[PDB]
């Protein structure tokens, strides 16, 4: 799974 500290609200490009 993703890093818990990461933010899903980002540009994927």
């Amino acid at each position, epitope marked *: *799974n*993703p*890093d*818990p*500290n*990461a*933010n*899903p*609200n*980002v*540009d*994927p490009n």
Partner: antibody
Amino acid sequence: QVQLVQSGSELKKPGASVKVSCKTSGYTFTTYAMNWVRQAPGQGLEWMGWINTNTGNPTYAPGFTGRFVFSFDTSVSTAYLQISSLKAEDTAVYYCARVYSYGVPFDYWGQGTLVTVSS
Amino acid sequence: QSVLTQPASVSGSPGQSITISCTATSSNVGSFNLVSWYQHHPGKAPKLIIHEVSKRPSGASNRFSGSKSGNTASLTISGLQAEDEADYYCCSYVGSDTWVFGGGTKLTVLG
């Protein structure tokens, strides 16, 4: 203070439209995703999807595809939920909820908006 | 048919401790470490009380704790009090930037 404040109760006929608002304050609106959650009478919470406030892209859960629209207006830091082809079984409380991170989802919630659909 | 299974109801008497289970029924939870819990009183917004299986945010009493064994996450409430009577939901990331809630558990405090 982070605050999500939703619009008031709605009463609609089957086949009508509805648009619910979620006005935010106390944080940078485009840094965090806005999620939507539905609770029908005598049922649990159901995750409906989210809108990416950096790109604008919406993501719908299965079962909320086809007639649901997530949007936002950055000039007033408000997110919106639009529902078409309303039917009686859309009667529910609709919540917006912020996601801070993968580890901390739904840390702040709107107070809910009741939408009643009846003929 | 949620992918996270919770008992429909649990009960306890004031002062006791109770446990609510949340078992994942699918592999889309992956490592199952992005598990959060919510307390929901009627007429009020749900409240985050546990995230990342066991982390307690500021504002949630230290009577609320989360754990995991295998694919079953558990919420434990210590020193049960009348105001704990509410609905409780577990929640998991389920990949591709999607989330799911458990069916919820109604906690009754027999006071």
